Amino acid sequence: MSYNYVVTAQKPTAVNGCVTGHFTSAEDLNLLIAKNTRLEIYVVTAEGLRPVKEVGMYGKIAVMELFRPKGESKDLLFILTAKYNACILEYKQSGESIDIITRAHGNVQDRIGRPSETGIIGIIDPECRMIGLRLYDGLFKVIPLDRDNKELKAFNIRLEELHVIDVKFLYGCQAPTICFVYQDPQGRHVKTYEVSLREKEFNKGPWKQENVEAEASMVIAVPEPFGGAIIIGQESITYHNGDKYLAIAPPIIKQSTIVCHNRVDPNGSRYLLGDMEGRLFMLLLEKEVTLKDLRVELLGETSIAECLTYLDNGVVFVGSRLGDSQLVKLNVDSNEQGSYVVAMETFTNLGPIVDMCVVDLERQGQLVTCSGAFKEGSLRIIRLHIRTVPLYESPRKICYQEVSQCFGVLSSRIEVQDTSGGTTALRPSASTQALSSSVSSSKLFGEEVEVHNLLIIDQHTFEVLHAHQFLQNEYALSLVSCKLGKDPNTYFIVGTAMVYPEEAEPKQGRIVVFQYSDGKLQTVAEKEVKGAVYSMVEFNGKLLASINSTVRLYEWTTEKELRTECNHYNNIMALYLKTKGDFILVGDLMRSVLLLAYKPMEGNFEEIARDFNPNWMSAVEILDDDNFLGAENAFNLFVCQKDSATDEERQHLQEVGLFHLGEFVNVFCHGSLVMQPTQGSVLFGTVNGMIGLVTSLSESWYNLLLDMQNRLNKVIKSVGKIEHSFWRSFHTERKTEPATGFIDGDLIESFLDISRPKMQEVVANLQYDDGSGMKREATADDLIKVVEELTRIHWSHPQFEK
Amino acid sequence: EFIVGGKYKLVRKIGSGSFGDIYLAINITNGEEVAVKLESQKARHPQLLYESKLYKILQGGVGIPHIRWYGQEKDYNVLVMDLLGPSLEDLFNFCSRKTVLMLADQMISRIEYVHTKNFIHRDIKPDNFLMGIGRHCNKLFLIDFGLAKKYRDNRTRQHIPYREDKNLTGTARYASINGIEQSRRDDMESLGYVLMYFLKAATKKQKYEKISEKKMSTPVEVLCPAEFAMYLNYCRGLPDYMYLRQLFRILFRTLNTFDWT
Amino acid sequence: IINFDTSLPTSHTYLGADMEEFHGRTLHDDDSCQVIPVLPQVMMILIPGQTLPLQLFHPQEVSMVRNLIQKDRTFAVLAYSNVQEREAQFGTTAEIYAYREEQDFGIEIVKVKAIGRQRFKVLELRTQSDGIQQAKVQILPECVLPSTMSAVQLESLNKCQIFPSKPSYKWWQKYQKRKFHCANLTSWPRWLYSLYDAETLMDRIKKQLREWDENLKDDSLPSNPIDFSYRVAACLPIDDVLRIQLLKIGSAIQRLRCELDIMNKCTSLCCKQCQETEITTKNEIFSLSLCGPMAAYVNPHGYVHETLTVYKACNLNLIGRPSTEHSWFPGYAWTVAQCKICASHIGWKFTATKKDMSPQKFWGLTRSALLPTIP
Numbered sequence A: 001m002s003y004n005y006v007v008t009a010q011k012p013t014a015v016n017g018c019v020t021g022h023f024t025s026a027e028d029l030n031l032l033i034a035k036n037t038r039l040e041i042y043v044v045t046a047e048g049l050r051p052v053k054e055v056g057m058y059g060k061i062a063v064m065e066l067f068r069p070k071g072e073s074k075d076l077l078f079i080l081t082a083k084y085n086a087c088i089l090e091y092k093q094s095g096e097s098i099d100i101i102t103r104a105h106g107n108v109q110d111r112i113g114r115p116s117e118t119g120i121i122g123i124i125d126p127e128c129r130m131i132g133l134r135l136y137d138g139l140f141k142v143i144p145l146d147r148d149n150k151e152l153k154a155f156n157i158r159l160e161e162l163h164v165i166d167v168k169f170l171y172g173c174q175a176p177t178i179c180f181v182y183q184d185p186q187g188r189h190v191k192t193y194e195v196s197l198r199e200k201e202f203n204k205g206p207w208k209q210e211n212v213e214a215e216a217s218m219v220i221a222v223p224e225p226f227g228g229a230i231i232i233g234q235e236s237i238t239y240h241n242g243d244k245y246l247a248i249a250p251p252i253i254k255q256s257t258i259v260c261h262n263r264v265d266p267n268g269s270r271y272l273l274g275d276m277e278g279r280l281f282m283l284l285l286e287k288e289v290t291l292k293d294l295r296v297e298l299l300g301e302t303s304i305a306e307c308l309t310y311l312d313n314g315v316v317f318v319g320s321r322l323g324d325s326q327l328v329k330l331n332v333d334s335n336e337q338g339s340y341v342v343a344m345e346t347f348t349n350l351g352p353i354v355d356m357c358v359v360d361l362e363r364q365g366q367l368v369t370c371s372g373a374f375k376e377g378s379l380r381i382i383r384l385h386i387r388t389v390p391l392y393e394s395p396r397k398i399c400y401q402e403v404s405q406c407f408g409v410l411s412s413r414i415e416v417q418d419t420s421g422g423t424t425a426l427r428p429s430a431s432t433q434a435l436s437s438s439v440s441s442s443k444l445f446g447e448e449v450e451v452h453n454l455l456i457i458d459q460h461t462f463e464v465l466h467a468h469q470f471l472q473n474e475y476a477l478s479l480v481s482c483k484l485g486k487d488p489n490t491y492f493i494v495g496t497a498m499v500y501p502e503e504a505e506p507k508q509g510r511i512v513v514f515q516y517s518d519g520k521l522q523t524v525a526e527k528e529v530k531g532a533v534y535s536m537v538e539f540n541g542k543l544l545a546s547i548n549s550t551v552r553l554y555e556w557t558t559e560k561e562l563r564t565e566c567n568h569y570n571n572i573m574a575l576y577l578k579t580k581g582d583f584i585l586v587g588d589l590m591r592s593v594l595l596l597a598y599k600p601m602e603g604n605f606e607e608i609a610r611d612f613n614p615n616w617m618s619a620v621e622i623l624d625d626d627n628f629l630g631a632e633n634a635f636n637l638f639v640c641q642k643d644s645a646t647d648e649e650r651q652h653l654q655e656v657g658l659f660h661l662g663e664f665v666n667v668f669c670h671g672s673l674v675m676q677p678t679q680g681s682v683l684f685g686t687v688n689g690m691i692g693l694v695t696s697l698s699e700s701w702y703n704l705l706l707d708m709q710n711r712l713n714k715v716i717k718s719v720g721k722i723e724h725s726f727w728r729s730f731h732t733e734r735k736t737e738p739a740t741g742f743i744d745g746d747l748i749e750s751f752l753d754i755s756r757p758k759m760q761e762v763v764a765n766l767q768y769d770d771g772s773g774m775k776r777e778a779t780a781d782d783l784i785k786v787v788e789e790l791t792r793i794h795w796s797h798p799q800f801e802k
Numbered sequence B: 001e002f003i004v005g006g007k008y009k010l011v012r013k014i015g016s017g018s019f020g021d022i023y024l025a026i027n028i029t030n031g032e033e034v035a036v037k038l039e040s041q042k043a044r045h046p047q048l049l050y051e052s053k054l055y056k057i058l059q060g061g062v063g064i065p066h067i068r069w070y071g072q073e074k075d076y077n078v079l080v081m082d083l084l085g086p087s088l089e090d091l092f093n094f095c096s097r098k099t100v101l102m103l104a105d106q107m108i109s110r111i112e113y114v115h116t117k118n119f120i121h122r123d124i125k126p127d128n129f130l131m132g133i134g135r136h137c138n139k140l141f142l143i144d145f146g147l148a149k150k151y152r153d154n155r156t157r158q159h160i161p162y163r164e165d166k167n168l169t170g171t172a173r174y175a176s177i178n179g180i181e182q183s184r185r186d187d188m189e190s191l192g193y194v195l196m197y198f199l200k201a202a203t204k205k206q207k208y209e210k211i212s213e214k215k216m217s218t219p220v221e222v223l224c225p226a227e228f229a230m231y232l233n234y235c236r237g238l239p240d241y242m243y244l245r246q247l248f249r250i251l252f253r254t255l256n257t258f259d260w261t
Numbered sequence C: 001i002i003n004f005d006t007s008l009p010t011s012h013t014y015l016g017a018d019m020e021e022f023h024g025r026t027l028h029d030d031d032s033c034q035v036i037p038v039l040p041q042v043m044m045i046l047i048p049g050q051t052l053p054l055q056l057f058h059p060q061e062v063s064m065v066r067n068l069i070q071k072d073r074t075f076a077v078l079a080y081s082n083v084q085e086r087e088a089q090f091g092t093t094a095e096i097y098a099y100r101e102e103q104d105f106g107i108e109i110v111k112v113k114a115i116g117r118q119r120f121k122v123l124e125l126r127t128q129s130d131g132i133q134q135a136k137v138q139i140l141p142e143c144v145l146p147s148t149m150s151a152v153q154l155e156s157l158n159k160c161q162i163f164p165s166k167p168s169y170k171w172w173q174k175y176q177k178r179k180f181h182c183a184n185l186t187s188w189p190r191w192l193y194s195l196y197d198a199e200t201l202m203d204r205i206k207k208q209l210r211e212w213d214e215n216l217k218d219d220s221l222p223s224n225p226i227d228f229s230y231r232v233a234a235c236l237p238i239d240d241v242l243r244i245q246l247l248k249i250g251s252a253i254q255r256l257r258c259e260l261d262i263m264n265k266c267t268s269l270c271c272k273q274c275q276e277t278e279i280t281t282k283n284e285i286f287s288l289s290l291c292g293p294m295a296a297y298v299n300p301h302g303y304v305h306e307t308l309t310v311y312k313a314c315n316l317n318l319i320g321r322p323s324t325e326h327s328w329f330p331g332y333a334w335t336v337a338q339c340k341i342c343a344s345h346i347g348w349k350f351t352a353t354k355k356d357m358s359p360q361k362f363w364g365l366t367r368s369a370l371l372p373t374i375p
């Protein structure tokens, strides 16, 4: 409602960065893994990874680096957040207690400027003298690393080149030298500069070159005694060092693009390369003092990697966003072709979550999600206890049919065009290895096509019972399971579209009704429509469908056909469609919320209210009759309500809640008792693999929790000294605003983790409106009871460190 | 300046000596040349409303204009229509003082429309015919309907019962026999005198009655093709005018653009 | 449009080629309350970037313009829902860049050329004693939105997120595949995201316009989405309610989508009085000016007409002789055109004087007398 509560049920599982070094101690190798807002520190042992510390950050980690300035015992950590909070951190251990000390902090945002489309780049020079940040186009930000710079004072230098791809610091230079690749109307070029801290200007670089591939994207700074840089492109790998030039065009890397790299040897002898499909490569540099040749070889297949890191004993960490992270072993020998990899450990990743459903509410619900993409796609069953069902293709939508005791999954696979006019599969997938198969109709280079299938899955064994392949060029968009009219049968209903590359807007589509009976899937009825069926919902025994921009209501006839009842035409596309009673919630991709009602006597649709604010929207939900929930651009949640106190105001929806979550929400579901003072229960799944819970509070509870939140902010020490209020503020490129109407449950549940004297300090002078009726000085025990009752609305996280 | 209804502007004078001096208006929003007949609210001759009503009952045709606006403005009533053009009279005497009879059947065709539209013009003179401008440069238009008698009555047009000893001065040179009330025959008899055209004094008994008696003293054959002279006679005998038209088409074809064109 | 100069109609040379030209801008900050004078005679919906010529006769307007020249040169053009009671909810701010005054005929005339700058919302209308209208104004913001992938994009592909420039159906396939690669991390496919991409929408609009009007040079349209949308909205021959709807839109993407929807829906221009006869078809529309097929011109008596230039028109009646005075298009003579049925003013027919020019015959039609038919 107007006052909501947001808590984390599952922490994000996707990896966006990882570094090695000596952070905990100078004699121990440490792996630091950056997940969204979570920092995990591991010690590299012979057995594997030993967790020691995990911390939460008040921001999304964008830059993470380890550096050792002169006169320091061990490494320091540099963190930059997506809201431009820059900190330098130290690891301190006094017996059992472990803390992260903040050495310097500040905000490096510029009041004017447009964020770069290629993102945020952060580099530290090998001599530990400055920090280079690329935050806005045409500007380069330098942070000196002197001891007496604790507010992180920075100055800006002007870059003539507006479109910069990558930038790095070079080894072996007497002055801090940077190398970067930029794009201009001529093409892409490589250039160097020298950075003077006295003059705060760019000097002339040691060398300049022009011969850079049109698809060059990666810069690698080779250490001593080689020096120079390696530029990685789609077809060629080049080494530039002054007058030296070497190039290779290996045929093995043309299939996919190299997206990540890491260094194996301290002197740059060997490097690790990873591409978009999961291939692992080795880059070898030959030496006589000077470089002779470059060689590339294939090591094997791993998960689709976002980052790669070497762990100093032949063990490599694969940090994935589309699938499970791996620890692999590089062997000198092989099985088929030289130097294969062997997997030894797998770490769970639930992201991305594109759809989900709640099942088995009779007795304690369970969550079934569509996770991953390409060969990493799978079904996750969450009780936390997680079970994995690999599909080896991309799951899109999911629903549950209780009468048949089966799941309906919409999926897609990628096939390449062969010379014979047909298509060939790249790997065995679920849709190719089903018990029974069917097609809608049979029809007949190196181009990738999408084939869409409907999969029936047993709820006990999770095997594939029936696969149905749709028409060529048909894109399946929606899926429902329901009973229609007076029919006692349950049906699978799929809404599709016809997508041709020469047509911008689909002009054809169809709605198909399937029935699963006696172990086979049959087609009952099909209806041809003149648009794309983006969404479908069951509306009081009828079918509500969204064709392009119109909303159509269908009736199920005794002859097993769909008959149109009423049409409603809008100016927007009905991408999002939710229902409660007789009310319909409509939304498009540009955050245009429309509230409609069905007039049963008149047999048409009436418009109740609307709210048009141009911003990118990813999901919506209905909390109750009056309040509606949604997800905004950046990573935000909003709540709108109606009829708050003429028709001008009654037809307007105003925003009563704003919050910055930090995650991109894809799906909302009513998981009332998935995990068995609060009202309602809604779950959401994000791109990073995070699962959250939204409940509704009353006025008194909201006031109490807001006051407790404000008091807790004064006593809890943040990592990097970021303020919680700034972190939770609604963020857009054009507007920033404090959060309203939302209670942060993670901070509230942090109350149980603090020491008793700090609890006494927090609970001092707090008037408690107990159930007795009269307010009295609250004690720590009452707030402990309140917080434990709040934690009971979701499961309990297990211990992380040993 | 005199702005007619806040939409027109009277720039100059094109005809005077009339009941309504015919001005040249200009549309301040379009640019079109417009004819405006202007008469006083206390003018001696209020023909403005008369002719506007006759135009209104005309409602279409190749010889009747379109009324752009009517109503009234302060003490000067106003009628705005399309700019008609030059009078057939002020083209026959300006040019030089086939064309005659080709126009005549156009006039003959015009009068069928007025007779079929249940009224009579009754005031036929070369002044009252005007050539169009531009697209209408070759089409005859009959105007000056202020002196036009309306036969519309209950149900179908009923000719009012004839009344002897009537006076006619509008058709000064075409009065002819007309005590006898002006009617369909009287319309077409003035046309023959117009086709023929193609001792005065203050006393009317000498300036109108003597002209009429000399007009009908001798048969039309001596004054005149004698065949169409006797068509005129038997046209004045008045039904027959449809026959007269077909006969005049025969005459037009049996003779093996106009003067100024 | 051969041997004819398209830049001539833009200078409005029929008013005088010796105007006083003013260089400078004045942009009001977003979401602020300001008081702006309103010209009492203008009944036009001004789109930003559009040029408005004016001839002012009444002394109060002359005094207002003389005062405005010395102070921020901004007046308000109200998009009236209905001109009957002079009420409106939105409008635009117009700035003067050309000004001259003449004492002809014993009276005072002021000639002004103005350009539209900013959209606003009307809070209050005050008609003070002297006889002019001052309005309380809130400046509406221009909404610039980032790429849809800026919320889902992985940082690794962001390096290749820029692409080599244009040399193209294969190129647009590559653009869609590579720009919206991370669409598989969400619930929507790539073509849906292409349906909300400003560059793709601009390309589609340009393709449609070039198909309808082949003489459209490639560089005649702006490269910015906002300017492109404003120019297209100005040049579209639509009715007042649709123009108000386009003026209420704050985002360039939504404006482009609305313009595509207007273009795709079949249209044949019909008379407003009759609503049954068809004057012109969309195939016979050509751009004789640099601005486009439609632009605003002023007549000798200070009435602003929006003229659409078409090669051929049907069921029109020509009254009068070709007159060359005060012609909006130099080297042509105009004849008044009325509807063959209702005899209402629809426009003019222009016939050239020389014989080495081209075209020699064409038609100009006023927007207020035209109605778009949607089957």
Ligand SMILES: N#Cc1ccc(NC(=O)Nc2ncccc2OCc2ccccc2)c(O)c1
Pocket (backbone or CB within 6 Å): C209, C212, C213, C216, C220, C221, C222, C231, C232, C235, C236, C237, C262, C263, C267, C282, C283, C285, C286, C287, C290, C291, C292, C293, C372
């Ligand atoms: N600079 C510049 C510039 C800007 C705009 C344009 N054209 C246009 O807006 N419409 C246009 N044009 C040519 C032919 C047909 C056209 O649509 C006719 C139409 C559209 C919608 C509804 C009804 C009819 C230009 O030719 C140049």
Ligand SMILES: O=C1CC[C@@H](N2Cc3cc(NC(=O)c4ccccc4)ccc3C2=O)C(=O)N1
Pocket (backbone or CB within 6 Å): B009, B011, B026, B027, B028, B029, B030, B031, B032, C298, C299, C300, C301, C325, C326, C327, C328, C329, C334, C348
């Ligand atoms: O291209 C174009 C541009 C000009 C545009 N005009 C020309 C025009 C003249 C007029 N009468 C006059 O000035 C005028 C002339 C003589 C005496 C008194 C007044 C009225 C309206 C319009 C009018 O709207 C037109 O018709 N076509």
Ligand SMILES: [Zn+2]
Pocket (backbone or CB within 6 Å): C271, C272, C273, C274, C275, C277, C339, C340, C341, C342, C343, C344
């Ligand atoms: Zn008409």
